[PDB]
Design a binder for these strands. Structure first.
Ligand SMILES: [Mg+2]
Ligand SMILES: [Mg+2]
Ligand SMILES: [Mg+2]
Ligand SMILES: [Mg+2]
Ligand SMILES: [Mg+2]
Ligand SMILES: [Mg+2]
Ligand SMILES: [Mg+2]
Ligand SMILES: [Mg+2]
Ligand SMILES: [Mg+2]
Ligand SMILES: [Mg+2]
Ligand SMILES: [Mg+2]
Ligand SMILES: [Mg+2]
Ligand SMILES: [Mg+2]
Ligand SMILES: [Mg+2]
Ligand SMILES: [Mg+2]
Ligand SMILES: [Mg+2]
Ligand SMILES: [Mg+2]
Ligand SMILES: [Mg+2]
Ligand SMILES: [Mg+2]
Ligand SMILES: [Mg+2]
Ligand SMILES: [Mg+2]
Ligand SMILES: [Mg+2]
Ligand SMILES: [Mg+2]
Ligand SMILES: [Mg+2]
Ligand SMILES: [Mg+2]
Ligand SMILES: [Mg+2]
Ligand SMILES: [Mg+2]
Ligand SMILES: [Mg+2]
Ligand SMILES: [Mg+2]
Ligand SMILES: [Mg+2]
Ligand SMILES: [Mg+2]
Ligand SMILES: [Mg+2]
Ligand SMILES: [Mg+2]
Ligand SMILES: [Mg+2]
Ligand SMILES: [Mg+2]
Ligand SMILES: [Mg+2]
Ligand SMILES: [Mg+2]
Ligand SMILES: [Mg+2]
Ligand SMILES: [Mg+2]
Ligand SMILES: [Mg+2]
Ligand SMILES: [Mg+2]
Ligand SMILES: [Mg+2]
Ligand SMILES: [Mg+2]
Ligand SMILES: [Mg+2]
Ligand SMILES: [Mg+2]
Ligand SMILES: [Mg+2]
Ligand SMILES: [Mg+2]
Ligand SMILES: [Mg+2]
Ligand SMILES: [Mg+2]
Ligand SMILES: [Mg+2]
Ligand SMILES: [Mg+2]
Ligand SMILES: [Mg+2]
Ligand SMILES: [Mg+2]
Ligand SMILES: [Mg+2]
Ligand SMILES: [Mg+2]
Ligand SMILES: [Mg+2]
Ligand SMILES: [Mg+2]
Ligand SMILES: [Mg+2]
Ligand SMILES: [Mg+2]
Ligand SMILES: [Mg+2]
Ligand SMILES: [Mg+2]
Ligand SMILES: [Mg+2]
Ligand SMILES: [Mg+2]
Ligand SMILES: [Mg+2]
Ligand SMILES: [Mg+2]
Ligand SMILES: [Zn+2]
Lengths: 275, 65, 131
RNA sequence: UAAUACGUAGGGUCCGAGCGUUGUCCGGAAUUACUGGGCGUAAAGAGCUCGUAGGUGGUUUGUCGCGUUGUUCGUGAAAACUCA
RNA sequence: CGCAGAUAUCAGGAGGAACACCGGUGGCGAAGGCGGGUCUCUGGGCAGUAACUGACGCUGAGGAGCGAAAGCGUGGGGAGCGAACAGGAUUAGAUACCCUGGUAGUCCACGCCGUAAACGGUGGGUACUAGGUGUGGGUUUCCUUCCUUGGGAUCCGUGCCGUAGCUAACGCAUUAAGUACCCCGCCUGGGGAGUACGGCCGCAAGGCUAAAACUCAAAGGAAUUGACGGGGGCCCGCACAAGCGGCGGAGC
């Protein structure tokens, strides 16, 4: 749920968080951790590519099985549903009857002690992965893939996941959280059930310190920049920039997608706003 | 006003299996007619509606074709 | 809740007189029996009786009416009721119809009429003004 | 514009060595309804429930009588009211 | 809104709200109110056996829970409808009635707010008091076909009319305003004003408790007859219609 904090000090009056009362562990499975580090928003050159990002609290990366096909026909137990900061959602560790422990995303309403099976024969209960040949139309799924074994790439959205629509030939149409419908091949794999932490968006940062914690640096407003460094820069006082807003590099709002994409044909329609 | 035809103990029971029975009380249009014309139980009519409408959901009576 | 048997009995009597009844049936009680004593000896109720019923003993009241259909009892109002209870001293005994009525007084001897109490010098609680 | 209601006259009424105005208070005021109110619309039943305290009790079998009246002497100042 | 191919009309797809007929002066719920079905958990009311407890009863200041719609927060949803808002129109004037559209809201989840002509304008519970006409619920019992709103009786809820009574009257009339009993809210002429100040609640809109001054000598209720009605039924007139000829033009 949500616990609103009590306004002891001024910088802590609006800070409301979600209670992680469900976790069971306090130190991640160490056989499945790799080194990571705040990249600082810099490419091979070292020149900053994306602003606002860099610094913050160091984090430890863990490899988690979005490839969930390497094991089929072998069940696993939901060992412990632990928390990784690196990702929005929650990762739950599974014990396989084989003897592997692999990390995966924790779907909504999943609790320790349930059973997990991964294959074309699995049941339809939430938390099971299986190519879309074997999944009824209309169900709600997540952690979807974009081709037969390229690794799930879409709908990791903590709190939202895709909706299957209809199978024709070798493609399936998906209603998906951006409000868009995508034709995609049906040989991919997916899992049934909404993702967990549906209340994550309820967090109120409330304190610049924690924003820094999560890592992003401050944003320097437009009309305050100097005119040399940015189109709206300048103006003794507050002046709109005398022109329609524009990105710091001279391109204003409006369409940006490069159509003609290999997936341009695969897309059905385009997202709607204010409809 | 005519009699409660169902409501003898000799009369047939109430259910949705009797497609002919439900047709006999649903008009050709496929709507439920009035007690004021049918002359049966108000209670019996409750049962008739439940059975006929169960049949409709099980696809036994036309939906205003 | 039958929270005043005396009031209910008197209401039944007056209602039966209004509706022109002949017999009124009520659950039997010691207070009902002695009050019937009082009224019958005064001549307002033709005669009472106590019988046996399915559960508890009851009573039936036999009234009279004036020779020209006249009602026997004209008005019936309780005086001392649960909550509001009224007593009287030996001298301030209540007067009803200037003596033409009968007020039921609870005195040491029991329940006696207003004249009996006045002659005996005893007093108590006035039950009902019967006219 | 033609007053038994203004003022003047007469005449009359009540009262009277006092007669009016004013002001305080009771009454009719049952117009704060104990005696002795009402709640549909005239002013009023709260929006409806459970239920603490308080208020109240469906029967008879049993004593103490503290609620009660029962009487006897035993207090209730004078002064004021009522009788002679 | 259409000649960029509208409407219509047919195939397919999407998606949200709501379930005609059954369906009524009917069920239930204490009250708001509640009905397309299926399942899941579950409340309340009634009939016969009357087995058992045995004065445990009633109702309730404060308190606390429930409580239509509108409104507010958070995040989803958002077909239709639709405050506000634009235009078209009538009008002297229309910031409306009407038309085109159309954002809040309307729906979901959790919190809120607690007011309605929240009406049966009637607090709850018990006892008694002539009937007539129906519904639904459950029981029995007999003409007995034992088919059968055939007949009898019973108790619960539910519509209308009616005696006596009551009532200001209209009206109520056993599901009372009747005749009583027990408890609780409330009122004392109309404005002022259910508002100002205050206390409490609410994040708010505001809600709850609840004043005085000054002014008026009436305001209100049911009912009687008029009058009138861009309220209804039945009637008549160069009233209308069909015809001629006319004045409003000029002089007189
Ligand atoms: Mg804050
Ligand atoms: Mg550790
Ligand atoms: Mg790592
Ligand atoms: Mg370089
Ligand atoms: Mg940025
Ligand atoms: Mg550093
Ligand atoms: Mg996280
Ligand atoms: Mg989209
Ligand atoms: Mg900025
Ligand atoms: Mg600057
Ligand atoms: Mg520079
Ligand atoms: Mg420049
Ligand atoms: Mg500047
Ligand atoms: Mg300037
Ligand atoms: Mg732009
Ligand atoms: Mg049935
Ligand atoms: Mg007794
Ligand atoms: Mg009294
Ligand atoms: Mg003069
Ligand atoms: Mg004078
Ligand atoms: Mg004189
Ligand atoms: Mg006076
Ligand atoms: Mg009074
Ligand atoms: Mg009133
Ligand atoms: Mg009221
Ligand atoms: Mg209120
Ligand atoms: Mg003594
Ligand atoms: Mg003594
Ligand atoms: Mg003495
Ligand atoms: Mg002396
Ligand atoms: Mg004196
Ligand atoms: Mg069409
Ligand atoms: Mg026994
Ligand atoms: Mg109580
Ligand atoms: Mg109590
Ligand atoms: Mg109270
Ligand atoms: Mg209280
Ligand atoms: Mg509550
Ligand atoms: Mg509460
Ligand atoms: Mg609404
Ligand atoms: Mg609402
Ligand atoms: Mg608003
Ligand atoms: Mg809200
Ligand atoms: Mg929203
Ligand atoms: Mg929508
Ligand atoms: Mg509109
Ligand atoms: Mg307009
Ligand atoms: Mg509209
Ligand atoms: Mg109110
Ligand atoms: Mg209502
Ligand atoms: Mg009430
Ligand atoms: Mg009562
Ligand atoms: Mg009647
Ligand atoms: Mg009469
Ligand atoms: Mg009644
Ligand atoms: Mg009354
Ligand atoms: Mg006053
Ligand atoms: Mg007020
Ligand atoms: Mg206040
Ligand atoms: Mg208030
Ligand atoms: Mg009136
Ligand atoms: Mg009239
Ligand atoms: Mg003409
Ligand atoms: Mg002429
Ligand atoms: Mg002329
Ligand atoms: Zn029947």
């Amino acid at each position: 749920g949500i616990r609103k904090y009590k306004p002891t000090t001024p910088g802590r009056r609006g800070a409301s968080v979600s209670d992680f009362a469900e976790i069971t562990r306090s130190t991640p499975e160490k056989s499945l951790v790799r080194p990571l580090h705040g990249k600082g928003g810099r490419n091979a050159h070292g020149r900053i590519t994306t602003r606002h990002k860099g610094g913050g609290h160091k984090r430890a990366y863990r490899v988690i099985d979005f490839r969930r096909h390497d094991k089929d026909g072998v069940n696993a137990k939901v060992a412990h549903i632990e928390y990784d900061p690196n990702r929005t959602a929650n990762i739950a560790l599974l014990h396989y009857l084989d003897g592997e422990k692999r990390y995966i995303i924790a779907p909504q309403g999943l609790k320790q002690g349930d059973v997990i099976e991964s294959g074309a024969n699995a049941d339809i209960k939430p938390g099971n992965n299986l190519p879309l040949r074997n999944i009824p139309a209309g169900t709600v799924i997540h952690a979807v893939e974009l081709r037969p074994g390229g690794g799930a790439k879409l709908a990791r959205s903590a709190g939202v996941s895709i909706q299957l629509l209809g199978k024709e030939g070798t493609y399936a149409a998906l209603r998906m959280p951006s409000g868009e419908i995508r034709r995609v091949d049906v040989r991919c794999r997916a899992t049934v059930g909404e993702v967990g932490n549906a209340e994550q968006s309820n967090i109120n940062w409330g304190k610049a310190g924690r924003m820094r914690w999560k890592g992003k640096r401050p944003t320097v407003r437009g009309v305050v920049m100097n005119p040399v460094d940015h189109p709206h820069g300048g103006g003794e006082g507050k002046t709109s920039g005398g022109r329609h807003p524009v990105s710091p590099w001279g391109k204003p709002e409006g369409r940006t997608r490069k159509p003609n994409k290999p997936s341009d044909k695969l897309i059905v329609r385009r997202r709607r706003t204010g409809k | 006003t005519r009699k409660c035809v169902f409501c003898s103990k000799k009369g047939q029971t109430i259910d949705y299996k009797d497609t002919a029975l439900l047709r006999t009380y649903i008009s050709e249009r496929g709507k439920i007619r009035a007690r004021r014309v049918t002359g049966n139980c108000v209670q019996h009519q409750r049962d008739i509606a439940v059975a006929v409408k169960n049949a409709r959901e099980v696809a036994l009576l036309p939906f205003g074709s | 809740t039958m929270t005043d048997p005396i009031a209910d009995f008197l209401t039944r009597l007056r209602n039966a007189n209004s509706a022109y009844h002949d017999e009124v049936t009520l659950p039997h009680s010691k207070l009902k029996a002695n009050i019937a004593e009082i009224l019958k000896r005064e001549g307002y109720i033709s005669d009472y009786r106590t019988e046996d019923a399915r559960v508890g003993k009851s009573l039936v009241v036999q009234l009279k009416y004036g020779p020209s259909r006249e009602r026997s009892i004209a008005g019936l109002r309780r005086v001392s009721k649960p909550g509001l209870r009224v007593y009287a001293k030996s001298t301030n005994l209540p007067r009803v119809l200037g003596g033409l009525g009968v007020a039921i007084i609870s005195t040491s001897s029991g329940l006696l009429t207003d004249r009996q109490a006045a002659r005996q010098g005893v007093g108590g609680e006035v039950l009902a003004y019967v006219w």
